mmCIF file of C-alpha atoms in Angstrom:
data_model
loop_
_atom_site.group_PDB
_atom_site.id
_atom_site.type_symbol
_atom_site.label_atom_id
_atom_site.label_comp_id
_atom_site.label_asym_id
_atom_site.label_seq_id
_atom_site.Cartn_x
_atom_site.Cartn_y
_atom_site.Cartn_z
ATOM 1 C CA UNK A 1 -8.020 -1.740 6.752
ATOM 2 C CA UNK A 2 -9.736 0.185 10.036
ATOM 3 C CA UNK A 3 -13.038 0.677 10.996
ATOM 4 C CA UNK A 4 -14.321 -0.693 7.099
ATOM 5 C CA UNK A 5 -16.323 -4.229 6.779
ATOM 6 C CA UNK A 6 -16.126 -7.298 3.587
ATOM 7 C CA UNK A 7 -16.544 -5.749 0.465
ATOM 8 C CA UNK A 8 -19.003 -7.243 -1.524
ATOM 9 C CA UNK A 9 -16.647 -9.845 -3.206
ATOM 10 C CA UNK A 10 -15.004 -8.143 -6.679
ATOM 11 C CA UNK A 11 -16.316 -4.685 -6.301
ATOM 12 C CA UNK A 12 -13.499 -3.022 -6.996
ATOM 13 C CA UNK A 13 -12.299 -5.167 -10.003
ATOM 14 C CA UNK A 14 -9.824 -3.038 -10.153
ATOM 15 C CA UNK A 15 -8.016 -4.079 -6.442
ATOM 16 C CA UNK A 16 -4.994 -6.479 -6.332
ATOM 17 C CA UNK A 17 -3.055 -7.932 -4.205
ATOM 18 C CA UNK A 18 0.572 -7.707 -4.129
ATOM 19 C CA UNK A 19 2.667 -10.577 -2.873
ATOM 20 C CA UNK A 20 6.505 -11.647 -2.182
ATOM 21 C CA UNK A 21 7.967 -15.032 -2.989
ATOM 22 C CA UNK A 22 8.022 -17.142 -0.009
ATOM 23 C CA UNK A 23 9.480 -21.248 -0.243
ATOM 24 C CA UNK A 24 6.962 -22.219 -3.558
ATOM 25 C CA UNK A 25 4.347 -20.204 -1.882
ATOM 26 C CA UNK A 26 3.304 -16.920 -1.597
ATOM 27 C CA UNK A 27 2.440 -14.466 1.074
ATOM 28 C CA UNK A 28 0.389 -11.039 0.309
ATOM 29 C CA UNK A 29 2.337 -7.269 1.474
ATOM 30 C CA UNK A 30 0.965 -4.732 -0.706
ATOM 31 C CA UNK A 31 -2.080 -3.815 -2.375
ATOM 32 C CA UNK A 32 -2.344 -1.836 -6.271
ATOM 33 C CA UNK A 33 -4.470 -1.238 -8.483
ATOM 34 C CA UNK A 34 -4.647 -2.992 -12.530
ATOM 35 C CA UNK A 35 -4.403 -0.202 -14.944
ATOM 36 C CA UNK A 36 -3.673 -2.193 -18.518
ATOM 37 C CA UNK A 37 -3.843 -5.137 -18.731
ATOM 38 C CA UNK A 38 -0.441 -6.402 -18.318
ATOM 39 C CA UNK A 39 0.201 -3.004 -15.638
ATOM 40 C CA UNK A 40 0.076 -2.319 -12.069
ATOM 41 C CA UNK A 41 -0.078 0.568 -10.514
ATOM 42 C CA UNK A 42 1.323 0.472 -6.827
ATOM 43 C CA UNK A 43 3.204 2.611 -3.881
ATOM 44 C CA UNK A 44 7.535 3.129 -4.583
ATOM 45 C CA UNK A 45 8.278 1.924 -0.770
ATOM 46 C CA UNK A 46 5.808 -1.607 -2.087
ATOM 47 C CA UNK A 47 8.542 -2.884 -4.114
ATOM 48 C CA UNK A 48 11.899 -0.642 -4.200
ATOM 49 C CA UNK A 49 13.659 -4.278 -2.857
ATOM 50 C CA UNK A 50 14.907 -7.480 -4.209
ATOM 51 C CA UNK A 51 12.315 -9.564 -3.797
ATOM 52 C CA UNK A 52 10.167 -12.075 -7.138
ATOM 53 C CA UNK A 53 6.463 -10.349 -6.465
ATOM 54 C CA UNK A 54 2.834 -11.402 -8.687
ATOM 55 C CA UNK A 55 -0.527 -10.469 -9.338
ATOM 56 C CA UNK A 56 -3.626 -11.821 -7.808
ATOM 57 C CA UNK A 57 -5.961 -10.262 -10.290
ATOM 58 C CA UNK A 58 -9.624 -10.958 -9.642
ATOM 59 C CA UNK A 59 -8.705 -11.623 -5.458
ATOM 60 C CA UNK A 60 -11.595 -12.178 -2.133
ATOM 61 C CA UNK A 61 -10.749 -14.124 0.266
ATOM 62 C CA UNK A 62 -7.037 -14.519 -0.187
ATOM 63 C CA UNK A 63 -6.689 -18.133 1.482
ATOM 64 C CA UNK A 64 -9.555 -19.274 -0.520
ATOM 65 C CA UNK A 65 -9.732 -20.076 -4.754
ATOM 66 C CA UNK A 66 -13.496 -18.902 -4.858
ATOM 67 C CA UNK A 67 -13.248 -19.350 -9.042
ATOM 68 C CA UNK A 68 -12.320 -14.959 -10.590
ATOM 69 C CA UNK A 69 -8.366 -14.801 -8.580
ATOM 70 C CA UNK A 70 -5.805 -15.071 -11.591
ATOM 71 C CA UNK A 71 -2.678 -15.464 -11.246
ATOM 72 C CA UNK A 72 0.847 -13.735 -12.493
ATOM 73 C CA UNK A 73 4.774 -13.320 -11.909
ATOM 74 C CA UNK A 74 5.390 -9.801 -12.055
ATOM 75 C CA UNK A 75 7.326 -8.815 -15.858
ATOM 76 C CA UNK A 76 9.840 -5.513 -14.508
ATOM 77 C CA UNK A 77 9.903 -3.012 -12.076
ATOM 78 C CA UNK A 78 9.716 0.770 -12.366
ATOM 79 C CA UNK A 79 10.248 2.321 -9.103
ATOM 80 C CA UNK A 80 9.487 6.645 -9.285
ATOM 81 C CA UNK A 81 13.525 8.128 -9.704
ATOM 82 C CA UNK A 82 12.782 10.069 -6.989
ATOM 83 C CA UNK A 83 11.859 8.528 -4.455
ATOM 84 C CA UNK A 84 13.069 8.158 -1.319
ATOM 85 C CA UNK A 85 13.138 5.213 1.173
ATOM 86 C CA UNK A 86 14.576 7.136 3.817
ATOM 87 C CA UNK A 87 11.438 9.988 2.858
ATOM 88 C CA UNK A 88 8.185 9.016 2.558
ATOM 89 C CA UNK A 89 6.727 12.276 3.345
ATOM 90 C CA UNK A 90 8.840 13.944 0.247
ATOM 91 C CA UNK A 91 6.743 11.743 -2.157
ATOM 92 C CA UNK A 92 7.399 10.640 -5.399
ATOM 93 C CA UNK A 93 5.750 7.152 -3.553
ATOM 94 C CA UNK A 94 4.374 5.272 -6.808
ATOM 95 C CA UNK A 95 6.176 2.816 -8.927
ATOM 96 C CA UNK A 96 4.556 1.025 -11.976
ATOM 97 C CA UNK A 97 4.610 -3.219 -12.617
ATOM 98 C CA UNK A 98 4.807 -4.806 -16.186
ATOM 99 C CA UNK A 99 3.519 -8.156 -15.726
ATOM 100 C CA UNK A 100 4.914 -11.283 -17.049
ATOM 101 C CA UNK A 101 1.613 -11.982 -19.110
ATOM 102 C CA UNK A 102 -1.463 -10.141 -19.634
ATOM 103 C CA UNK A 103 -4.372 -10.236 -17.479
ATOM 104 C CA UNK A 104 -7.758 -12.049 -19.191
ATOM 105 C CA UNK A 105 -10.249 -8.540 -18.384
ATOM 106 C CA UNK A 106 -13.842 -9.529 -17.143
ATOM 107 C CA UNK A 107 -16.560 -8.900 -14.637
ATOM 108 C CA UNK A 108 -14.523 -9.100 -11.648
ATOM 109 C CA UNK A 109 -11.593 -7.949 -13.032
ATOM 110 C CA UNK A 110 -11.337 -4.518 -14.830
ATOM 111 C CA UNK A 111 -8.754 -1.727 -14.827
ATOM 112 C CA UNK A 112 -9.390 1.051 -12.025
ATOM 113 C CA UNK A 113 -10.087 4.869 -13.982
ATOM 114 C CA UNK A 114 -7.297 7.404 -13.088
ATOM 115 C CA UNK A 115 -8.072 10.949 -12.887
ATOM 116 C CA UNK A 116 -7.572 13.611 -15.245
ATOM 117 C CA UNK A 117 -4.272 15.414 -14.714
ATOM 118 C CA UNK A 118 -4.276 17.692 -12.376
ATOM 119 C CA UNK A 119 -7.798 16.956 -10.881
ATOM 120 C CA UNK A 120 -7.706 18.212 -6.860
ATOM 121 C CA UNK A 121 -10.587 17.292 -5.076
ATOM 122 C CA UNK A 122 -12.741 19.664 -2.540
ATOM 123 C CA UNK A 123 -12.299 19.683 1.011
ATOM 124 C CA UNK A 124 -14.428 16.391 2.180
ATOM 125 C CA UNK A 125 -15.208 13.681 -0.724
ATOM 126 C CA UNK A 126 -16.541 10.916 -1.114
ATOM 127 C CA UNK A 127 -13.595 8.133 -1.338
ATOM 128 C CA UNK A 128 -13.802 4.526 -0.167
ATOM 129 C CA UNK A 129 -10.250 2.660 1.129
ATOM 130 C CA UNK A 130 -10.446 -1.087 -0.125
ATOM 131 C CA UNK A 131 -7.206 -3.235 1.158
ATOM 132 C CA UNK A 132 -6.250 -6.975 2.862
ATOM 133 C CA UNK A 133 -4.605 -4.952 5.390
ATOM 134 C CA UNK A 134 -5.034 -5.110 8.768
ATOM 135 C CA UNK A 135 -8.239 -4.057 11.543
ATOM 136 C CA UNK A 136 -7.027 -4.146 14.441
ATOM 137 C CA UNK A 137 -3.225 -3.052 15.778
ATOM 138 C CA UNK A 138 -1.827 -5.954 16.869
ATOM 139 C CA UNK A 139 -3.489 -8.222 14.225
ATOM 140 C CA UNK A 140 -3.288 -9.953 10.966
ATOM 141 C CA UNK A 141 -4.094 -9.760 7.066
ATOM 142 C CA UNK A 142 -7.612 -9.209 6.790
ATOM 143 C CA UNK A 143 -8.444 -12.797 5.048
ATOM 144 C CA UNK A 144 -11.510 -10.452 2.799
ATOM 145 C CA UNK A 145 -10.710 -8.049 0.964
ATOM 146 C CA UNK A 146 -12.334 -4.648 2.974
ATOM 147 C CA UNK A 147 -13.947 -1.551 2.514
ATOM 148 C CA UNK A 148 -14.002 1.741 4.582
ATOM 149 C CA UNK A 149 -15.467 5.173 4.200
ATOM 150 C CA UNK A 150 -12.435 8.568 4.108
ATOM 151 C CA UNK A 151 -13.852 11.089 2.805
ATOM 152 C CA UNK A 152 -10.732 13.870 1.057
ATOM 153 C CA UNK A 153 -8.597 16.470 3.775
ATOM 154 C CA UNK A 154 -8.576 19.068 1.163
ATOM 155 C CA UNK A 155 -4.075 20.526 1.341
ATOM 156 C CA UNK A 156 -4.801 23.448 3.411
ATOM 157 C CA UNK A 157 -6.557 21.688 6.257
ATOM 158 C CA UNK A 158 -4.555 18.262 5.837
ATOM 159 C CA UNK A 159 -0.876 20.811 6.261
ATOM 160 C CA UNK A 160 -2.377 23.176 9.447
ATOM 161 C CA UNK A 161 -0.850 22.075 12.678
ATOM 162 C CA UNK A 162 -2.993 19.848 14.138
ATOM 163 C CA UNK A 163 -3.168 18.083 11.229
ATOM 164 C CA UNK A 164 -0.140 16.922 9.342
ATOM 165 C CA UNK A 165 2.224 19.521 9.012
ATOM 166 C CA UNK A 166 4.297 20.648 6.584
ATOM 167 C CA UNK A 167 4.749 16.462 5.994
ATOM 168 C CA UNK A 168 1.884 16.372 4.125
ATOM 169 C CA UNK A 169 2.805 17.507 0.061
ATOM 170 C CA UNK A 170 0.949 19.034 -3.455
ATOM 171 C CA UNK A 171 1.333 15.921 -4.962
ATOM 172 C CA UNK A 172 -1.046 14.313 -1.622
ATOM 173 C CA UNK A 173 -3.957 13.800 -1.050
ATOM 174 C CA UNK A 174 -5.408 12.864 2.856
ATOM 175 C CA UNK A 175 -8.565 10.946 3.482
ATOM 176 C CA UNK A 176 -9.436 10.478 6.991
ATOM 177 C CA UNK A 177 -8.249 11.312 10.201
ATOM 178 C CA UNK A 178 -11.001 10.800 12.131
ATOM 179 C CA UNK A 179 -9.697 8.218 14.523
ATOM 180 C CA UNK A 180 -12.453 5.293 14.021
ATOM 181 C CA UNK A 181 -11.225 4.171 9.763
ATOM 182 C CA UNK A 182 -7.581 4.252 7.958
ATOM 183 C CA UNK A 183 -5.617 2.125 5.905
ATOM 184 C CA UNK A 184 -3.632 0.214 7.295
ATOM 185 C CA UNK A 185 -0.397 -2.701 7.723
ATOM 186 C CA UNK A 186 -0.989 -4.050 4.778
ATOM 187 C CA UNK A 187 -2.908 -2.114 2.516
ATOM 188 C CA UNK A 188 -0.027 0.174 1.371
ATOM 189 C CA UNK A 189 0.089 -0.108 -2.816
ATOM 190 C CA UNK A 190 -3.625 0.266 -3.092
ATOM 191 C CA UNK A 191 -6.734 2.794 -4.362
ATOM 192 C CA UNK A 192 -8.274 5.452 -2.710
ATOM 193 C CA UNK A 193 -11.842 4.925 -5.467
ATOM 194 C CA UNK A 194 -13.223 8.169 -5.110
ATOM 195 C CA UNK A 195 -16.213 8.710 -6.938
ATOM 196 C CA UNK A 196 -15.751 11.667 -9.550
ATOM 197 C CA UNK A 197 -18.558 12.448 -12.464
ATOM 198 C CA UNK A 198 -20.322 9.047 -12.467
ATOM 199 C CA UNK A 199 -17.147 6.656 -11.915
ATOM 200 C CA UNK A 200 -14.894 5.329 -9.226
ATOM 201 C CA UNK A 201 -11.655 7.052 -9.455
ATOM 202 C CA UNK A 202 -9.231 5.651 -8.689
ATOM 203 C CA UNK A 203 -7.250 9.474 -6.744
ATOM 204 C CA UNK A 204 -5.039 8.338 -4.628
ATOM 205 C CA UNK A 205 -2.315 5.557 -3.909
ATOM 206 C CA UNK A 206 -2.204 4.707 -0.449
ATOM 207 C CA UNK A 207 1.167 5.504 1.026
ATOM 208 C CA UNK A 208 1.565 6.638 4.731
ATOM 209 C CA UNK A 209 -0.049 7.151 8.222
ATOM 210 C CA UNK A 210 1.049 8.610 11.739
ATOM 211 C CA UNK A 211 3.760 6.707 13.266
ATOM 212 C CA UNK A 212 1.378 6.947 16.423
ATOM 213 C CA UNK A 213 -0.846 4.564 14.798
ATOM 214 C CA UNK A 214 -2.904 3.485 12.061
ATOM 215 C CA UNK A 215 -5.764 4.650 12.807
ATOM 216 C CA UNK A 216 -5.534 8.151 15.181
ATOM 217 C CA UNK A 217 -7.335 11.719 14.421
ATOM 218 C CA UNK A 218 -6.429 14.207 13.265
ATOM 219 C CA UNK A 219 -3.292 11.965 11.307
ATOM 220 C CA UNK A 220 -5.452 11.152 7.960
ATOM 221 C CA UNK A 221 -4.441 8.123 5.834
ATOM 222 C CA UNK A 222 -1.980 9.703 2.945
ATOM 223 C CA UNK A 223 -1.841 8.938 -0.431
ATOM 224 C CA UNK A 224 0.009 10.046 -3.593
ATOM 225 C CA UNK A 225 -1.667 11.953 -5.382
ATOM 226 C CA UNK A 226 -2.728 10.282 -9.174
ATOM 227 C CA UNK A 227 -2.921 13.091 -11.212
ATOM 228 C CA UNK A 228 0.094 14.333 -10.659
ATOM 229 C CA UNK A 229 0.883 11.153 -12.035
ATOM 230 C CA UNK A 230 -0.496 10.836 -15.558
ATOM 231 C CA UNK A 231 2.255 12.049 -17.655
ATOM 232 C CA UNK A 232 4.966 9.689 -15.511
ATOM 233 C CA UNK A 233 2.392 6.571 -15.851
ATOM 234 C CA UNK A 234 2.069 6.907 -18.944
ATOM 235 C CA UNK A 235 4.726 7.574 -20.685
ATOM 236 C CA UNK A 236 6.670 4.365 -18.598
ATOM 237 C CA UNK A 237 3.957 1.566 -20.386
ATOM 238 C CA UNK A 238 5.112 3.571 -24.262
ATOM 239 C CA UNK A 239 8.375 3.736 -23.030
ATOM 240 C CA UNK A 240 8.734 -0.127 -20.950
ATOM 241 C CA UNK B 1 25.807 -0.471 17.467
ATOM 242 C CA UNK B 2 22.646 -1.304 15.760
ATOM 243 C CA UNK B 3 21.355 -4.767 18.324
ATOM 244 C CA UNK B 4 20.529 -1.804 20.691
ATOM 245 C CA UNK B 5 18.170 0.755 18.126
ATOM 246 C CA UNK B 6 14.599 1.368 18.846
ATOM 247 C CA UNK B 7 12.224 -0.875 17.750
ATOM 248 C CA UNK B 8 10.986 0.570 13.983
ATOM 249 C CA UNK B 9 7.390 0.081 12.718
ATOM 250 C CA UNK B 10 8.092 3.759 10.444
ATOM 251 C CA UNK B 11 5.514 5.130 8.828
ATOM 252 C CA UNK B 12 4.155 3.325 5.637
ATOM 253 C CA UNK B 13 1.617 0.803 5.526
ATOM 254 C CA UNK B 14 2.636 -2.267 3.701
ATOM 255 C CA UNK B 15 3.012 -5.834 5.086
ATOM 256 C CA UNK B 16 6.659 -6.387 6.014
ATOM 257 C CA UNK B 17 7.910 -9.827 8.558
ATOM 258 C CA UNK B 18 10.238 -8.739 9.971
ATOM 259 C CA UNK B 19 12.796 -9.056 13.386
ATOM 260 C CA UNK B 20 14.199 -6.929 16.253
ATOM 261 C CA UNK B 21 16.674 -7.456 19.290
ATOM 262 C CA UNK B 22 14.335 -6.631 21.893
ATOM 263 C CA UNK B 23 15.891 -4.706 24.842
ATOM 264 C CA UNK B 24 12.614 -4.783 28.222
ATOM 265 C CA UNK B 25 12.856 -9.402 27.138
ATOM 266 C CA UNK B 26 16.165 -10.151 25.702
ATOM 267 C CA UNK B 27 15.104 -12.168 22.656
ATOM 268 C CA UNK B 28 15.148 -11.522 18.996
ATOM 269 C CA UNK B 29 11.236 -11.147 17.517
ATOM 270 C CA UNK B 30 9.102 -10.872 15.395
ATOM 271 C CA UNK B 31 7.759 -7.694 14.902
ATOM 272 C CA UNK B 32 5.507 -6.244 10.719
ATOM 273 C CA UNK B 33 8.506 -3.624 9.236
ATOM 274 C CA UNK B 34 5.741 -0.667 7.247
ATOM 275 C CA UNK B 35 8.476 -0.415 3.983
ATOM 276 C CA UNK B 36 10.287 2.171 4.376
ATOM 277 C CA UNK B 37 12.562 4.363 6.876
ATOM 278 C CA UNK B 38 13.364 1.880 8.429
ATOM 279 C CA UNK B 39 17.047 1.395 11.070
ATOM 280 C CA UNK B 40 19.400 -1.029 12.061
ATOM 281 C CA UNK B 41 17.335 -3.386 14.481
ATOM 282 C CA UNK B 42 15.575 -4.797 11.488
ATOM 283 C CA UNK B 43 16.177 -7.455 9.493
ATOM 284 C CA UNK B 44 14.816 -9.912 7.122
ATOM 285 C CA UNK B 45 15.643 -13.422 8.648
ATOM 286 C CA UNK B 46 15.594 -14.034 11.865
ATOM 287 C CA UNK B 47 18.699 -15.521 11.685
ATOM 288 C CA UNK B 48 20.106 -12.746 11.226
ATOM 289 C CA UNK B 49 19.130 -11.250 13.679
ATOM 290 C CA UNK B 50 20.902 -13.859 16.181
ATOM 291 C CA UNK B 51 24.116 -13.831 13.789
ATOM 292 C CA UNK B 52 24.413 -10.263 13.597
ATOM 293 C CA UNK B 53 23.832 -9.534 17.820
ATOM 294 C CA UNK B 54 23.256 -12.398 19.858
#
């Protein structure tokens, strides 16, 4: 997250760190949202590859065990079947991960609340992006979880020629684009949290930015719109 | 071939450490790949890169 600040520890208890096997250790690559005791929602591009993954819930500092963390393997990966790696702007950047053991829910580990099917946010809706992604160009992953205020840009504005034009689809959420705050490398798969009807709901799954750079004016960070996938999410979990 | 292809990070916001063969410099070199839309000058391992074009 570029232009953000360190989150209060465990203040976003559905946020997960998605890590791939390295030697006998583990390395962060993407975010995710805990949506069941044994399921995580992430980006397709994070897991459409032959790696061994684990998920960390209750995480804040990536290189220090503070006591709220639980480390669980990934049992099953279900990439959206329409996802195309050569065309992120086509959409369908979503995947579900079943965990090899259920996590224990507590004050630090909570399910992300999802929007009702079809929900579209009004322009300039207040949202927050979180993650351990880069905080500067050519930086390292953040040590501690970061957040940034990232208000939505509606489909009409985001699809204009000065913004994203035809690149953005109605199945996506645009947020930010002020040239100060944005997602960056390592933030993919994570939530865009939006306060709607009195609770923070996860309306977005972090997907992409302009090739110009993470933080670019009129190139908002682009998220998969969770509300467009509620039936798909529920059916995969009921079946798998 | 592929070693002559440009370094390409892509649009996605993943954090995937990879290697590419650098032209202005002349050596296989680390970079952060975003996780989608990669091209040919993108190797999961430094040993792949060298064997592949070096």
